[PDB]
C-alpha cells in the first residue's frame, strides 16, 4: 500500500523499446551483444533484432513501474533439455537507488521458474559488485564460481561471481 | 607423433559416430542436432562462422579423436576447450598429449589469454590430468546438465596465456 | 542384465534421410491419412520434401527401431513440448515383424529416452479403444488411462474412439531406475 | 567534454561532407566511393561487418570529427586509426584528445596490442603530437598514395598496449 | 640451356589448384587469409574462392617447372589508383633450395610491371628471413619499413621488413 | 590567382541520384539514342533503374558542372580502363547555359580530376567534324588528333564523321603544373 516498488511489472520488449535499450550504455566504453552478435551502433542493433525476432534462446522483457521504462531483463543462453537459463538485470542509472534491483529480480525468478518451467537460474556479477552479491544472498541464490578474468573491461581483467538458485526452493519460498 | 589437423567435412562420419547413441543432446555451433544429416547441414551452414573451430586429433594417420574450441570471443580472448578421444583410443595417455596440442593452438595461435574446460565432478582422471598441466579449478556448477536421467554436478577448470607461454614457450 | 540372462538386442537410433523408403512402406495403402510435421502426404517425393523442410524441427522426433541391424518399425515423439514438458509418442511395427513383442520393448526405450534424455514430465499416447491387447501392454508398462476420445478419427468409412493414456516422470524414475 | 560516440546512419552527411570536392578517392570497407548515395549503400553492406568501426568526436553536443579504426585484426590484436577533424574545428587541441580517445577505444576497450597511423611526412604538427603520445616510427613508406598529381610518401607511427595501460591506466 | 630454373613460369591460379594450395600450410599452425577472410578448412577455402572469382583486388599464379607446380604467386592490397600491390611468393617445402624463390620473384615483378601497369610493388619478409632480405636487395628492392612485432606468430610476436621497387627502376634494369 | 584576377566559380561534383531529373531533361526529345554504363534508355523510370544497378560501377564517372549553386551541365568519363590507363570523356552544357564558355571551364576540371586524381595517362574525347568550335577549343587545350571515324553515328537520318582527340599525362601535368 505504502511503498514505492510496488507499481514494478515486466513486458515482452518490443521493437519500439530499441532506443530505450540502446541508451543503456550507447558510450563506446563496452562490447554489447544482441543474441551473441556484437553490435555498436543502434542500426546494427535494428538489423540484429529483426534477424533474431523468432529465436527463443534469449527472452527479454522491460521492467516498468507507473508506465515509465526502469530497465530492462534478459533471459540468455537458454536451453529447455538441461532447463535452465542466464539472467542478468540493467537498471537505468536514472532509476538506480530505489530498490529496483531486487524486486526486478523477484520479477524474473518469477518468470523463469513459474512460467518457462526452468530447473536452474543463475547470473554474473563482478566480484567488487558487493551490494549485487548481498541483494542476490537474501533472495536465496549460492555462490557457484569464482570465474577467474572473465572479462576484459575498461583495461583491465575482472573477476567474476556465478550464483544459482533452483526450482524447487524457488517454488516452496515463494509460492507457500 | 600426435597432432592436430582442421576438421573437414569427411570428417563428419567420425565425428558423428563419437556418440550416435540416442543417450545426450549434442551441439554444433550451439543448435541441436542427432541425425547425421542433421549435423551435416548444421555444418554447412556455419563453415565461416569464427565463433567455434574443430580438429581432428590423429596419430600415425589415424584419426583418435576430436578438439573442440567453442565460445571463442577475441575482445575477452578466452574459449572453451573439449578434448574428445574415440573410445577405442581412450588406453594410450593421447587425451594429456591433445590437451597440450589444444592449449598450444589457443594461446600461440589464436592468440588468446584464456582457456577453459569443463568436466564432471566424478572424472577424478581427467581432473587430476588437467591439475597436472597447470589447470585450476574456478567453479563447481551444480547440476549444470541433465544426463541419462539426473542432474550433474561439473568443473570448471582454466590456465592462462602468460603461465603457458613462460612454461612451454621459452 | 549378468551372463545367465535374457537381453533383448532392440535399439533406437536417429532417424535418417535414408530411412524414408522404409518409414513410406510401412503403410503406403491409399488407406489412411500420414503425417509429417502435421503436414499431410502421401507420396514418396512429397514425404522427402517435407523432410528436408522440417529436419531442424525440434516439435517432433524420430527413431528407428532395429534388432540385429534388421529395421523393425519406428518410433514418433510428437506435440513435443517443453514448456508444459510433455510429448505424445507411437511406436509403429513393421507388419513383417508383428506378433513378436517388439512394440512392448520400444515403448520402454522411447519412454527411455523421453525421460531420461529429454527431460519430460508427461509422456501420453493414444490406442484404438478395441486395442485391448495394446492398452494392456501400455497399463503393465505404466500408463493410466486419461481420457476417451469420441469418435476422433474416421477410419475405414467409421469413427473411431480413442483411449488417451498417460505415465509422469517421477513415476518412471522410481519404478525403472 | 570530447567523448565518441558510435557512428550512425544520419551521421552520413557530416562524414560525406569531410571531403566532397572529387579531389581525393575515399574508402569504406575498403570500397571506393565519390557519391553520398554511393556512401550509403557501402554503409548498408557493412553495418555487421567487425573489420573496421567508427565513432563521431563530439564536443558539448556538436559533431567535431570522425575517428576510424580499420584493418582490425583480432589475432595479431593490431589497428590503423585515422583521426579527421572537420576543418572548422581544426583550431582547437582537438587532433590530441581524440587521439587520445582513439588510443583508450582500442587497448582498453578491443583489447588490441598495437595501434598504428598513417601521415604524411610534410605533416610535421601532427607527427610533432604523436611522438608527444608516445607513438615511434616504424616506417616511410615512399611514394605510397597517389594524390593531386603527385606521389606522397607518409610516415607509419605505433604504440604498444602495455605502455599505454601502465601510463594511462594505473 | 645448361640451368635449372629455366622451365619457371607462371599461371593463372585455377580451382583445380585450391588442394595443392591448402598443403602448403594445414598444420592448424596460422591463420591463412584468403581475400583478406580467415579459413582452416579445405572447404572453407573453397567457398571463400567461388566467392571472390571476379575480385580484382588479389591475383594469384601457380609457379611450375616442367608441368610440376612448385609454388604460389599472391598479389595482394591492389590498388590501380595509388598504382601498388603487396606480393608474396610461397615455395612449397619439397622444392626448396633449387633457386626458384628468386626467379619467381622476377616473374611476379614483370606480372605487375609490364601487364598490370603498377608502379610500386612492395612485400613483406620477416626481419630474420635472411637470405630473403639478400635476395630482394639483389633484385633492387630497398628497405622502407621496419613493423614491429606486426604478427603474431606461434607464440610470439614478429617483426617484419617492408622492401619495395618501383617501375621505372625495374622497366631500365630489365627491359634495357 | 590573386585579389585582381578573373577566376571562375565553375567547379565539378559528383552526380548523385538527386541529380538525374536534370540529366534525363539535357535532352528528352527521342531525337537521339542515349545510354548509361553502355545500356540503353529513353524514359526517367529506365534511366533510374540503370542509375540502382551500376552505382558501384568503376568503368565511368560522371560529375555535375555547376557555378555558383546552378547545375550548368554533366562531365562523363566512360571507357575507364586502369591497366591501359586511359578514358573517353565529353562534357555536356544544358542548352539555356550554351554560349558562355563553361564547355572549355569543365574541360580542364575534367582534365585534372582524370589525371590528378584517376591517375590516367590517356584521355580521349569524340566530336563531330563539322564541330571547328569545339575542335579549336580542344586543341587550344592541348589535345591532338589522332584519327578521324568515318560515319561512325547516324545521328538525325544520317552517318557522321567524328574526330578523335587525345592529351597524355606527362604533357599535361608539364604545361599546367
Ligand atoms: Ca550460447
Ligand atoms: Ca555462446
Ligand atoms: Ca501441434
Ligand atoms: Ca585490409
Ligand atoms: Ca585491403
Ligand atoms: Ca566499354
Redesign the interface.
Known amino acids: 500500500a505504502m511503498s514505492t516498488t510496488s507499481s514494478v511489472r515486466l513486458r515482452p520488449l518490443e521493437r519500439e523499446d530499441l532506443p530505450f535499450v540502446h541508451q543503456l550504455d ?6 554489447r551483444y544482441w543474441f ?9 542493433l535494428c ?2 533484432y529483426d534477424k533474431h525476432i523468432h529465436d527463443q ?1 534469449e527472452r527479454r522483457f522491460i521492467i516498468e513501474s507507473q508506465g515509465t521504462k526502469i530497465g530492462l531483463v534478459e533471459l540468455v543462453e537458454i536451453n ?5 537459463a542466464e539472467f542478468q538485470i540493467i537498471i537505468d542509472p536514472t532509476h538506480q537507488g530505489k530498490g529496483y534491483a531486487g524486486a526486478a529480480a523477484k520479477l524474473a525468478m518469477e518468470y523463469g521458474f513459474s ?3 526452468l ?2 537460474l543463475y547470473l554474473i556479477v563482478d566480484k567488487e559488485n558487493e551490494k549485487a552479491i548481498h541483494i542476490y544472498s537474501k533472495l536465496g541464490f ?1 555462490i ?9 573491461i ?4 575482472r573477476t567474476v561471481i ?1 550464483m ?1 538458485i ?1 526450482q524447487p526452493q524457488y517454488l516452496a519460498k515463494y509460492k507457500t
Chains 1, 5 share one sequence.
Open positions: 550507447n558510450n563506446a566504453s563496452i562490447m551473441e552478435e556484437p553490435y555498436e551502433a543502434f542500426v546494427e538489423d540484429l534462446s529447455h533439455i538441461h532447463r535452465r512460467v518457462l518451467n530447473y536452474k549460492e557457484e564460481g569464482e570465474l577467474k578474468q572473465e572479462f576484459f575498461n583495461g583491465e581483467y556465478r544459482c533452483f
